[PDB]
Amino acid sequence: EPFRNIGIIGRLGSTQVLDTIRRLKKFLIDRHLHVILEDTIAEVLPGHGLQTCSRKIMGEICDLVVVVGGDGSMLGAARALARHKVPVLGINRGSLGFLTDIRPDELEAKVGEVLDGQYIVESRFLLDAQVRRGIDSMGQGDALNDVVLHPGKSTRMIEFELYIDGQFVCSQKADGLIVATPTGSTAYALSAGGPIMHPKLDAIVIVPMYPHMLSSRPIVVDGNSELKIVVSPNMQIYPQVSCDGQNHFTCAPGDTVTISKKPQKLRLIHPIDHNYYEICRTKLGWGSRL
Amino acid sequence: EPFRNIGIIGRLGSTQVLDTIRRLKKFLIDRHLHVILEDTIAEVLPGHGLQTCSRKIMGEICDLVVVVGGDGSMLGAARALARHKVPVLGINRGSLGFLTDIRPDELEAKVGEVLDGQYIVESRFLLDAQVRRGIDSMGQGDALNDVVLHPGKSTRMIEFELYIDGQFVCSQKADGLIVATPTGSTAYALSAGGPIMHPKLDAIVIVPMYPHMLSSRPIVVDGNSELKIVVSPNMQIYPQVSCDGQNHFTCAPGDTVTISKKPQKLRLIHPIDHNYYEICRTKLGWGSRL
Amino acid sequence: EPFRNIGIIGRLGSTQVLDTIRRLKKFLIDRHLHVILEDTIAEVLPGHGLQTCSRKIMGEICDLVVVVGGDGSMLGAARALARHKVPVLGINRGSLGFLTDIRPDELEAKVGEVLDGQYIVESRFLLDAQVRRGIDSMGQGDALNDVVLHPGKSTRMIEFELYIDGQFVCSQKADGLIVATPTGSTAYALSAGGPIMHPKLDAIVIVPMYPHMLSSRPIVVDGNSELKIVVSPNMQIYPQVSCDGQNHFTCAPGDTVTISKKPQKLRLIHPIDHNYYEICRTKLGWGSRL
Amino acid sequence: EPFRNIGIIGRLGSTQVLDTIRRLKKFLIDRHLHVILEDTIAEVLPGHGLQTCSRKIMGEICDLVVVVGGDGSMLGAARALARHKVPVLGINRGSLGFLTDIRPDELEAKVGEVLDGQYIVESRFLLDAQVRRGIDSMGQGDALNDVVLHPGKSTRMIEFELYIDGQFVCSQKADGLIVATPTGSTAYALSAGGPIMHPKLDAIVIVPMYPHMLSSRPIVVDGNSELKIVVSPNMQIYPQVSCDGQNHFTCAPGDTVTISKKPQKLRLIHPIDHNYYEICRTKLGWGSRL
Ligand SMILES: NC(=O)c1ccc[n+]([C@@H]2O[C@H](COP(=O)([O-])OP(=O)(O)OC[C@H]3O[C@@H](n4cnc5c(N)ncnc54)[C@H](OP(=O)(O)O)[C@@H]3O)[C@@H](O)[C@H]2O)c1
Ligand SMILES: NC(=O)c1ccc[n+]([C@@H]2O[C@H](COP(=O)([O-])OP(=O)(O)OC[C@H]3O[C@@H](n4cnc5c(N)ncnc54)[C@H](OP(=O)(O)O)[C@@H]3O)[C@@H](O)[C@H]2O)c1
Ligand SMILES: NC(=O)c1ccc[n+]([C@@H]2O[C@H](COP(=O)([O-])OP(=O)(O)OC[C@H]3O[C@@H](n4cnc5c(N)ncnc54)[C@H](OP(=O)(O)O)[C@@H]3O)[C@@H](O)[C@H]2O)c1
Ligand SMILES: NC(=O)c1ccc[n+]([C@@H]2O[C@H](COP(=O)([O-])OP(=O)(O)OC[C@H]3O[C@@H](n4cnc5c(N)ncnc54)[C@H](OP(=O)(O)O)[C@@H]3O)[C@@H](O)[C@H]2O)c1
């Protein structure tokens, strides 16, 4: 459907984000479009602008949400807007990102070209994490990048067992474990030794965090696999579970973390000019044409 | 169909392979089954046994081929028996392998349990490699593990461009490139930093061989992607292409190597006792149950 | 000097440590030697034994200290006994370690052979870490393995600058930094990608902890270099500094951590049967003789 | 001693090397200095210039040798000019290198500042490699970067044993082994996973080339250690030994390669403006000042 009510999500960061968020406000209101603003960012804006709503509310209000900032800002908007299946459009901070595509100086050219009816709809799946004490459920969180098990208030290594589709893989002693989507394969998992996974791929990568065992290597499994991490019951370690490094749960010795694909996919919007391997060449420095 | 004519493929290695190849000959002839032998191995056998045939011929003769040895012996049989779609059963040398499953001491117990009608049919796809000079074709080879570009008669680094589905990825200076299936993900690609890919996964992993660029990391793409490696035309390097490290082509500056999935899949046979993650725990040393 | 007053240091762990600590008590008292016990371990012992002292006190009382347990138990004793320059002898838990050498079943044979006058004296140097706010000093700690900067109560990456001998190296965004001795090169630094450093080597290795930059590789510098880590002043991150993962300081944005070699070396005692590369072959699984 | 007879060493590469080699010829003859040219490069020069000599002869003729090109050009000149202990000065191709320091546009400014008496003398040690069949010696070669054992005319893995100071380390199956100086630690060894070693460090790094064993990690040993690589006698593999990837020997099953530090050090000349960590920040992309 054509985009009428357009929401805006931003991050309270350097001044340039507040600059582009008003060029976007100007360019969109110029086209006689209703602009609804996030309440968590409208408390510090030029005259606070127009109507104000919350992030869970912005799903059913808006037909499109433009996120200004970087890849990190895209993670928070995705977890809330994927449930409503709202198209999401990302703006850079001048540097090309794996989730943000529009440069602040090409704002009017690329955003207008999307509103005029030339764009690509790409869907990225999220992860569903849930902690359980025997049968009782502690908490359930979503993740677009990764679900990361890591030590909680103790530098000591943690111990756990990995299960994929109820099948025992191994027990391991390490700092933790990174479970990443293709979207998150370029983030923490890449810094921990994991591979790059193309966004077309229906797969999940499991990356050990500095394992005490040198032969512990990343595994890539079917994206429809169900992961089950069992914290060591015979150890006094209380690890932490992080979803996109922003939502944190504290696990008890013996707690079980289940990770699987979320049914609701995030509807990413790109210009037709989008090229995934060009993002890799700029974000990682790969050589260009010979 | 029930297995009647059963072929045998072996490797001219240590004495134990010649030992198990005759226990298999005894156990199979005991069950009143026709045993056909590979000609390349029957030239040195106890009285040369029964009928003798070639590997390309063994496809339409036999209903099942038992390969004794290790994972390396499985690679040669797969490239010839996947075209005929002949079931293949592997025997260990005492140590569990990613392709061979039967231990020489459990030969009669596991092979009989397969012939009695309790087995798993698992299909593994191969790679199709073809070198081209402009339009003319040099050679075309198959690979169950990997297609590897590596330096040819020169320790100097090679230069090349990578294309996936006609889309330019990057140019790179390295020793070479490893393109591996899920089967080959545990071989050379694992030693070069690549991840483990579950056999259920329809994916191909591209691993750079000691790249001059430190940010060159492995990529995992859709298994239906078509890869196109273009040797640097402006360099006096003549690289070599290896298929399972056994079939070698010499590439010219500017030659293009195309790699894609082969339509014919190898029909692997396993006992019901087969567990993939148990192979990883023994081949790599991962910790067992807590 | 010949060893008369012999102290014992242990860890409150599995039952076998309490078993060997009494075979050592029997074997030493059998030889008419004064056995002094650590107070932190004598509170739970068979009748509490003989005299009891503290770890800082055990330096001037004893001529030799036998540490039962593993490599982790050796770290705590080293930081306190290196100031007094007391010889230290380590006992295994059945498995050969990089710091502990005696197997519990060869206790009487190897410990007696050392007391009879056949042993090797090997000295290992420690690290000296000190945090400073401008000029004021927060805390100063020693380390036999490593001084590790890591995130403090925030999964977000930390930012810092590295200085070696007052010379600027680089600024970096990562989980943290591992500064290890040759003793600690096989511990956390090895799991983070660092190299093995022979104990004869006067060198320090600096290993980045999952850096956001892929080209951030470990550096090995002169063991007499002075390291200076400056926490990012323009970031709201409060990192933590760990010495052997046991002593923890919380750093403020802008705090400077100085790391250099400690003058006092730890006097390690080994039997003449000691072989460093045999420890590597067992701890890491390297292949034995062809 | 003040530099009078100044030799020039270049590489037959792109046109710019032939350009700078004549600005250097102009600037030096302008200062009334005798310029002697390498015969292997004077066959294609503007009128062939002045006197012509060989590389082994250029040691006793010249007081200083200026090498134009890159790090690779510095390797060949070092092996021949380190025996004569002739100071060596390197010129860049516009990009800063680990061995070349002068940019072609700062040629007259930096080279003149060295001739005027403001420079640093830094000495880098080389490696001494010698192959032996039992007692007979095949060949002996020097290396400024690395001595590399790698497969010879066979993609199959090679097998060998490592000995350090006559002490057995391990047996290993891999593509090969990289033995690098601090100078070569940033070259092949860095691409194979090795660490950066500061030039002040008296150490040698041993890096396995894609080992079949995942726990085979680089080792850093004393620079005065004597290495002894024994090719597997029970294998039909004929590996090759490369010194700076330019001098090649073919080893037989059972041949022993001995590697140790060469007594003659290469006298490198740098301007006072030289900074080693600035080279790392540009060659590897590390972050600059915060
Ligand atoms: N050592 C590490 O590498 C490390 C440690 C902790 C967390 N992380 C990652 O950080 C994520 C959360 O980021 P945050 O905003 O909360 O702040 P953060 O933990 O400080 O991480 C911010 C950094 O992550 C990058 N990033 C985030 N998602 C990415 C993706 N899909 N591909 C590539 N780079 C990506 C950001 O790129 P922009 O600059 O464009 O935003 C930025 O450089 C986690 O999900 C985790 O994957 C990495
Ligand atoms: N440095 C390296 O790691 C390296 C170098 C060259 C080639 N290779 C691999 O060797 C393969 C060809 O082997 P080859 O028989 O001709 O002799 P080879 O090159 O000497 O390699 C033999 C080794 O490869 C192992 N191997 C083969 N396929 C494997 C798989 N799918 N998963 C795990 N391990 C596997 C074999 O296991 P078994 O002992 O059970 O046979 C054996 O240890 C190539 O396709 C390539 O992947 C690896
Ligand atoms: N992910 C990791 O690899 C990781 C994470 C945190 C800390 N660490 C290391 O743990 C050390 C402190 O150990 P802890 O007793 O307090 O418990 P810990 O953090 O849980 O680490 C205990 C483990 O470290 C091993 N270890 C300790 N020093 C070693 C050395 N020099 N060489 C090889 N292995 C060594 C121990 O061997 P034993 O079983 O023989 O004791 C044991 O396996 C730190 O200094 C740090 O280097 C490693
Ligand atoms: N895959 C690899 O990384 C690989 C493979 C084979 C050989 N090598 C290295 O190449 C060396 C021989 O080089 P070559 O001239 O004969 O041509 P080459 O094998 O094609 O290697 C040339 C490349 O090596 C770089 N290099 C050479 N010495 C270096 C050093 N000390 N630190 C950093 N980079 C260095 C060169 O830098 P410049 O552009 O400034 O010359 C150039 O990028 C060998 O000694 C070996 O270390 C590396």
Side-chain angles (χ1 to χ4, degrees), chain A residues 150 155-156 175 178 188 190-193 208-212 214 240 242 245 248 284, chain C residues 150 155-156 175 178 188 190-193 208-212 214 240 242 245 248 283-284:
Chain A
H150 57 91
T155 319
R156 294 196 62 102
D175 288 78
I178 301 173
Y188 205 165
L190 189 64
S191 305
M209 289 187 52
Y210 290 164
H212 180 260
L214 298 179
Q240 274 210 335
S242 293
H248 307 264
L284 308 181
Chain C
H150 57 91
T155 319
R156 294 196 62 102
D175 288 78
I178 301 173
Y188 205 165
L190 189 64
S191 305
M209 289 187 52
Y210 290 164
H212 180 260
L214 298 179
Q240 274 210 335
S242 293
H248 307 264
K283 268 263 188 169
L284 308 181

Short mmCIF file of all heavy atoms in Angstrom, two decimals, chain A residues 150 155-156 175 178 188 190-193 208-212 214 240 242 245 248 284, chain C residues 150 155-156 175 178 188 190-193 208-212 214 240 242 245 248 283-284:
data_model
loop_
_atom_site.label_atom_id
_atom_site.label_comp_id
_atom_site.label_asym_id
_atom_site.label_seq_id
_atom_site.Cartn_x
_atom_site.Cartn_y
_atom_site.Cartn_z
N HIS A 150 26.82 -15.00 27.84
CA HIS A 150 28.10 -14.44 28.25
C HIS A 150 28.15 -14.42 29.77
O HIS A 150 27.10 -14.51 30.42
CB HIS A 150 28.31 -13.04 27.66
CG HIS A 150 27.24 -12.06 28.01
ND1 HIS A 150 27.31 -11.25 29.13
CD2 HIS A 150 26.07 -11.76 27.40
CE1 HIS A 150 26.23 -10.49 29.18
NE2 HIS A 150 25.47 -10.78 28.15
N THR A 155 34.27 -13.07 35.84
CA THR A 155 35.16 -13.26 34.69
C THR A 155 35.42 -14.73 34.39
O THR A 155 35.91 -15.04 33.30
CB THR A 155 36.49 -12.53 34.94
OG1 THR A 155 36.23 -11.26 35.54
CG2 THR A 155 37.24 -12.31 33.63
N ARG A 156 35.09 -15.63 35.31
CA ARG A 156 35.33 -17.05 35.09
C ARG A 156 34.56 -17.56 33.88
O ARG A 156 33.50 -17.03 33.52
CB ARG A 156 34.93 -17.86 36.33
CG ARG A 156 35.78 -17.61 37.56
CD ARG A 156 35.57 -18.70 38.59
NE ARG A 156 35.97 -20.01 38.08
CZ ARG A 156 37.11 -20.61 38.38
NH1 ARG A 156 37.98 -20.08 39.22
NH2 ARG A 156 37.39 -21.79 37.83
N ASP A 175 33.84 -18.44 27.35
CA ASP A 175 33.20 -17.21 27.80
C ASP A 175 31.70 -17.25 27.51
O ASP A 175 30.90 -16.75 28.30
CB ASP A 175 33.85 -16.00 27.14
CG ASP A 175 35.24 -15.71 27.69
OD1 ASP A 175 36.19 -16.41 27.30
OD2 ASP A 175 35.36 -14.79 28.53
N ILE A 178 27.55 -17.32 20.79
CA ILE A 178 26.87 -16.34 19.95
C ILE A 178 26.02 -17.09 18.93
O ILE A 178 26.54 -17.89 18.15
CB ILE A 178 27.86 -15.39 19.25
CG1 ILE A 178 28.71 -14.64 20.28
CG2 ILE A 178 27.12 -14.41 18.36
CD1 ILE A 178 29.81 -13.81 19.67
N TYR A 188 28.80 -9.11 16.10
CA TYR A 188 29.62 -9.77 17.11
C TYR A 188 30.20 -11.08 16.59
O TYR A 188 31.38 -11.38 16.82
CB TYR A 188 28.79 -10.01 18.38
CG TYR A 188 29.59 -10.12 19.67
CD1 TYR A 188 28.95 -10.02 20.90
CD2 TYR A 188 30.96 -10.30 19.66
CE1 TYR A 188 29.66 -10.11 22.08
CE2 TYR A 188 31.68 -10.40 20.83
CZ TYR A 188 31.02 -10.30 22.04
OH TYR A 188 31.73 -10.39 23.22
N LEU A 190 31.09 -11.94 13.67
CA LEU A 190 32.24 -11.73 12.79
C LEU A 190 33.50 -11.42 13.59
O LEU A 190 34.59 -11.86 13.23
CB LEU A 190 31.93 -10.62 11.79
CG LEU A 190 32.96 -10.45 10.67
CD1 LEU A 190 32.99 -11.70 9.80
CD2 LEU A 190 32.66 -9.21 9.85
N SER A 191 33.36 -10.66 14.67
CA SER A 191 34.51 -10.36 15.51
C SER A 191 34.99 -11.58 16.29
O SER A 191 36.16 -11.62 16.70
CB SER A 191 34.18 -9.22 16.48
OG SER A 191 33.72 -8.08 15.79
N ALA A 192 34.13 -12.57 16.49
CA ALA A 192 34.48 -13.78 17.23
C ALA A 192 34.98 -14.90 16.33
O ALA A 192 35.22 -16.01 16.83
CB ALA A 192 33.29 -14.26 18.05
N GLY A 193 35.14 -14.66 15.03
CA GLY A 193 35.63 -15.67 14.12
C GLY A 193 34.59 -16.27 13.19
O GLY A 193 34.95 -17.11 12.36
N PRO A 208 31.36 -19.99 19.17
CA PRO A 208 31.82 -20.01 20.57
C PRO A 208 32.67 -18.79 20.89
O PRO A 208 33.47 -18.33 20.08
CB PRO A 208 32.65 -21.30 20.65
CG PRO A 208 32.33 -22.07 19.40
CD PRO A 208 31.99 -21.04 18.37
N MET A 209 32.49 -18.28 22.11
CA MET A 209 33.18 -17.07 22.57
C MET A 209 34.44 -17.47 23.32
O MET A 209 34.37 -17.86 24.49
CB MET A 209 32.26 -16.23 23.46
CG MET A 209 31.14 -15.53 22.74
SD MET A 209 30.25 -14.43 23.85
CE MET A 209 31.61 -13.48 24.53
N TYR A 210 35.59 -17.34 22.65
CA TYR A 210 36.91 -17.70 23.14
C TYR A 210 36.87 -19.00 23.92
O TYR A 210 37.00 -19.00 25.15
CB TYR A 210 37.50 -16.56 23.97
CG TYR A 210 37.85 -15.35 23.14
CD1 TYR A 210 38.07 -14.11 23.72
CD2 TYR A 210 37.96 -15.45 21.75
CE1 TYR A 210 38.39 -13.00 22.95
CE2 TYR A 210 38.27 -14.35 20.98
CZ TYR A 210 38.49 -13.13 21.58
OH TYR A 210 38.81 -12.04 20.81
N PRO A 211 36.67 -20.12 23.24
CA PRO A 211 36.52 -21.41 23.93
C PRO A 211 37.84 -21.88 24.53
O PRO A 211 38.91 -21.69 23.97
CB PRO A 211 36.04 -22.35 22.83
CG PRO A 211 36.62 -21.77 21.58
CD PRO A 211 36.62 -20.28 21.77
N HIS A 212 37.73 -22.51 25.70
CA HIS A 212 38.88 -23.18 26.30
C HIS A 212 39.39 -24.31 25.42
O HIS A 212 40.57 -24.67 25.52
CB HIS A 212 38.52 -23.71 27.69
CG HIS A 212 39.65 -24.40 28.38
ND1 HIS A 212 39.76 -25.78 28.42
CD2 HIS A 212 40.72 -23.92 29.05
CE1 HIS A 212 40.85 -26.11 29.09
NE2 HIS A 212 41.45 -25.00 29.49
N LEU A 214 40.43 -25.48 21.75
CA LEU A 214 40.86 -24.80 20.53
C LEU A 214 40.14 -25.31 19.29
O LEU A 214 40.09 -24.60 18.29
CB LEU A 214 42.37 -24.94 20.36
CG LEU A 214 43.23 -24.32 21.46
CD1 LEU A 214 44.70 -24.56 21.19
CD2 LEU A 214 42.94 -22.83 21.60
N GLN A 240 24.68 -14.57 31.75
CA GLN A 240 23.69 -13.61 31.26
C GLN A 240 23.39 -13.87 29.79
O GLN A 240 24.28 -14.25 29.02
CB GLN A 240 24.17 -12.17 31.45
CG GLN A 240 23.87 -11.58 32.82
CD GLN A 240 23.66 -10.08 32.78
OE1 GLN A 240 24.16 -9.39 31.88
NE2 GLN A 240 22.90 -9.56 33.74
N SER A 242 21.92 -12.04 26.36
CA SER A 242 21.72 -10.73 25.75
C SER A 242 21.09 -10.90 24.38
O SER A 242 21.55 -11.71 23.58
CB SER A 242 23.04 -9.97 25.64
OG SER A 242 23.55 -9.62 26.92
N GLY A 245 22.37 -7.36 22.46
CA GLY A 245 23.13 -6.66 23.48
C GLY A 245 22.36 -5.59 24.20
O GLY A 245 22.96 -4.63 24.70
N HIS A 248 18.64 -8.08 28.70
CA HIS A 248 19.50 -8.94 29.49
C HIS A 248 18.69 -9.75 30.49
O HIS A 248 17.85 -9.20 31.20
CB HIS A 248 20.57 -8.12 30.22
CG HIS A 248 21.34 -7.21 29.32
ND1 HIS A 248 22.56 -7.55 28.78
CD2 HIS A 248 21.06 -5.97 28.86
CE1 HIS A 248 22.99 -6.56 28.02
NE2 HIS A 248 22.10 -5.58 28.06
N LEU A 284 34.18 -3.41 5.23
CA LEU A 284 35.32 -4.26 5.54
C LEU A 284 36.57 -3.90 4.76
O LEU A 284 37.66 -4.37 5.13
CB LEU A 284 34.96 -5.74 5.28
CG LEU A 284 33.67 -6.23 5.94
CD1 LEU A 284 33.44 -7.70 5.64
CD2 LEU A 284 33.70 -5.98 7.44
N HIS C 150 38.28 -5.52 30.26
CA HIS C 150 37.06 -6.13 29.73
C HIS C 150 35.87 -5.28 30.16
O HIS C 150 35.99 -4.47 31.09
CB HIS C 150 36.91 -7.58 30.21
CG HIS C 150 36.91 -7.73 31.70
ND1 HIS C 150 35.75 -7.70 32.45
CD2 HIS C 150 37.92 -7.92 32.58
CE1 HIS C 150 36.05 -7.86 33.72
NE2 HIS C 150 37.36 -7.99 33.83
N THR C 155 27.40 -4.82 28.13
CA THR C 155 27.83 -5.64 27.01
C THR C 155 28.42 -4.82 25.86
O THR C 155 29.08 -5.40 24.99
CB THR C 155 26.66 -6.49 26.50
OG1 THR C 155 25.91 -6.99 27.61
CG2 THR C 155 27.15 -7.67 25.67
N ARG C 156 28.21 -3.51 25.86
CA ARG C 156 28.72 -2.67 24.78
C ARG C 156 30.25 -2.73 24.71
O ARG C 156 30.93 -2.98 25.71
CB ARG C 156 28.29 -1.21 24.98
CG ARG C 156 26.80 -0.98 24.85
CD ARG C 156 26.51 0.51 24.68
NE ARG C 156 27.11 1.04 23.46
CZ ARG C 156 26.45 1.27 22.34
NH1 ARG C 156 25.15 1.07 22.25
NH2 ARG C 156 27.12 1.73 21.28
N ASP C 175 35.89 -5.65 22.79
CA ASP C 175 35.49 -6.08 24.13
C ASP C 175 36.56 -5.71 25.15
O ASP C 175 36.24 -5.34 26.29
CB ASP C 175 35.21 -7.58 24.15
CG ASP C 175 33.91 -7.94 23.43
OD1 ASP C 175 33.91 -7.98 22.19
OD2 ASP C 175 32.90 -8.17 24.12
N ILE C 178 43.98 -8.17 26.25
CA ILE C 178 44.66 -9.15 27.09
C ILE C 178 46.16 -8.90 26.99
O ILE C 178 46.74 -8.94 25.89
CB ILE C 178 44.32 -10.59 26.68
CG1 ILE C 178 42.81 -10.83 26.78
CG2 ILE C 178 45.07 -11.58 27.55
CD1 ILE C 178 42.37 -12.17 26.25
N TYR C 188 44.04 -17.38 28.70
CA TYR C 188 43.04 -16.59 27.99
C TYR C 188 43.56 -16.12 26.64
O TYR C 188 42.83 -16.16 25.64
CB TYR C 188 42.63 -15.39 28.85
CG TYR C 188 41.25 -14.83 28.58
CD1 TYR C 188 40.64 -13.96 29.48
CD2 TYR C 188 40.55 -15.16 27.42
CE1 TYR C 188 39.38 -13.44 29.24
CE2 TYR C 188 39.29 -14.65 27.18
CZ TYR C 188 38.71 -13.79 28.09
OH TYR C 188 37.46 -13.28 27.85
N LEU C 190 45.56 -17.48 24.59
CA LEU C 190 45.51 -18.54 23.58
C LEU C 190 44.10 -18.74 23.05
O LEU C 190 43.91 -18.99 21.86
CB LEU C 190 46.05 -19.85 24.16
CG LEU C 190 46.27 -20.97 23.15
CD1 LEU C 190 47.34 -20.57 22.14
CD2 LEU C 190 46.64 -22.27 23.85
N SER C 191 43.09 -18.62 23.92
CA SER C 191 41.71 -18.74 23.47
C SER C 191 41.27 -17.55 22.63
O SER C 191 40.33 -17.68 21.84
CB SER C 191 40.78 -18.90 24.67
OG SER C 191 41.18 -20.00 25.48
N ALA C 192 41.94 -16.41 22.76
CA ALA C 192 41.59 -15.21 22.01
C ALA C 192 42.38 -15.07 20.71
O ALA C 192 42.24 -14.05 20.04
CB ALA C 192 41.80 -13.97 22.88
N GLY C 193 43.19 -16.06 20.35
CA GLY C 193 43.95 -16.02 19.12
C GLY C 193 45.43 -15.76 19.28
O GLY C 193 46.15 -15.75 18.27
N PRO C 208 43.98 -8.43 21.34
CA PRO C 208 42.67 -7.76 21.39
C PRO C 208 41.54 -8.76 21.56
O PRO C 208 41.55 -9.85 20.98
CB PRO C 208 42.58 -7.04 20.03
CG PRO C 208 43.98 -7.09 19.45
CD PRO C 208 44.59 -8.33 20.00
N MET C 209 40.55 -8.37 22.35
CA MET C 209 39.40 -9.22 22.67
C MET C 209 38.26 -8.92 21.71
O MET C 209 37.55 -7.92 21.88
CB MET C 209 38.96 -9.02 24.12
CG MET C 209 39.90 -9.57 25.16
SD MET C 209 39.17 -9.44 26.81
CE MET C 209 37.57 -10.19 26.53
N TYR C 210 38.09 -9.79 20.71
CA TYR C 210 37.10 -9.70 19.65
C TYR C 210 36.97 -8.26 19.16
O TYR C 210 35.97 -7.59 19.43
CB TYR C 210 35.75 -10.25 20.12
CG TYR C 210 35.78 -11.75 20.32
CD1 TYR C 210 34.79 -12.40 21.04
CD2 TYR C 210 36.79 -12.52 19.76
CE1 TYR C 210 34.82 -13.77 21.22
CE2 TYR C 210 36.83 -13.89 19.93
CZ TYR C 210 35.84 -14.51 20.66
OH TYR C 210 35.88 -15.88 20.82
N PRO C 211 37.98 -7.76 18.45
CA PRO C 211 37.97 -6.36 18.02
C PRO C 211 36.95 -6.11 16.93
O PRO C 211 36.71 -6.95 16.06
CB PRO C 211 39.40 -6.15 17.51
CG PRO C 211 39.82 -7.50 17.03
CD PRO C 211 39.17 -8.49 17.96
N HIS C 212 36.34 -4.92 16.99
CA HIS C 212 35.47 -4.48 15.91
C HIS C 212 36.23 -4.33 14.60
O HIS C 212 35.62 -4.40 13.53
CB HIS C 212 34.79 -3.15 16.29
CG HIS C 212 33.88 -2.62 15.24
ND1 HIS C 212 34.25 -1.62 14.36
CD2 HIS C 212 32.61 -2.95 14.91
CE1 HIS C 212 33.25 -1.35 13.54
NE2 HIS C 212 32.24 -2.15 13.85
N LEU C 214 38.82 -5.96 12.04
CA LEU C 214 39.27 -7.31 11.75
C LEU C 214 40.78 -7.41 11.62
O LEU C 214 41.33 -8.51 11.79
CB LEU C 214 38.60 -7.82 10.48
CG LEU C 214 37.08 -7.93 10.52
CD1 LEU C 214 36.54 -8.41 9.18
CD2 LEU C 214 36.63 -8.85 11.64
N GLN C 240 36.37 -2.83 33.29
CA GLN C 240 36.97 -3.49 34.45
C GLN C 240 38.33 -4.05 34.09
O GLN C 240 38.54 -4.53 32.97
CB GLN C 240 36.07 -4.61 34.99
CG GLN C 240 35.00 -4.14 35.96
CD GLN C 240 34.64 -5.20 36.98
OE1 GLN C 240 34.80 -6.40 36.74
NE2 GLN C 240 34.16 -4.77 38.14
N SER C 242 41.12 -6.90 35.24
CA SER C 242 41.25 -8.16 35.98
C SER C 242 42.70 -8.62 35.95
O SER C 242 43.33 -8.64 34.89
CB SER C 242 40.34 -9.24 35.39
OG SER C 242 38.97 -8.91 35.59
N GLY C 245 42.24 -12.79 36.47
CA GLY C 245 40.80 -12.96 36.61
C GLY C 245 40.32 -13.07 38.03
O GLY C 245 39.28 -13.69 38.29
N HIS C 248 39.85 -7.35 40.73
CA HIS C 248 39.06 -6.55 39.81
C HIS C 248 39.04 -5.09 40.25
O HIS C 248 38.78 -4.80 41.42
CB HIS C 248 37.64 -7.09 39.70
CG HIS C 248 37.57 -8.55 39.38
ND1 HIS C 248 37.42 -9.02 38.10
CD2 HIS C 248 37.66 -9.64 40.18
CE1 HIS C 248 37.41 -10.34 38.12
NE2 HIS C 248 37.55 -10.74 39.37
N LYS C 283 48.41 -31.05 26.90
CA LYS C 283 47.38 -30.05 27.15
C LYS C 283 46.65 -29.66 25.87
O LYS C 283 45.47 -29.28 25.92
CB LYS C 283 47.99 -28.81 27.80
CG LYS C 283 47.96 -28.81 29.32
CD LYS C 283 46.77 -28.02 29.84
CE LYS C 283 46.85 -27.84 31.35
NZ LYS C 283 45.83 -26.86 31.84
N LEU C 284 47.32 -29.75 24.72
CA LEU C 284 46.73 -29.33 23.45
C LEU C 284 46.49 -30.48 22.48
O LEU C 284 45.77 -30.29 21.49
CB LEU C 284 47.63 -28.28 22.78
CG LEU C 284 48.02 -27.09 23.67
CD1 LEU C 284 48.88 -26.10 22.90
CD2 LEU C 284 46.79 -26.41 24.24
#
